[PDB]
């Protein structure tokens, strides 16, 4: 995010803020993150397994 590397524990604050911001009627699923620019390449089947 912004030419800075973040650990997962580092981004815990951001994800917690994201869950706190959303209202009750809506869900968190499929929400844009314009701040983030890059993620390590990871396949779809691995994502399904992790989920």
């Amino acid at each position: 995010v912004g030419e800075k590397k973040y650990s997962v524990d580092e981004f815990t604050s951001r994800v917690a803020g994201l869950i706190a911001g959303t209202p009750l009627s809506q869900s968190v699923t499929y929400t844009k993150l314009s701040d983030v620019v890059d993620i390590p390449k990871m396949t779809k089947v691995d994502a399904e397994s992790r989920v």
Binding site: T29, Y30, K44, A47, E48, V51
Partner: protein
Amino acid sequence: AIGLPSINISFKELATTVKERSARGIIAMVLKDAKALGLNEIHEKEDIPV
């Protein structure tokens, strides 16, 4: 098991079907020769072996 969200669109043709019944009007012609032994499957009038 919960997986990734699924959005799927499917297109299909309405297969209007009339049942296929046993074929009628075919002839089995059996003959003797020394050329092109076996069946020849003359489905067309002008398709004739030489």
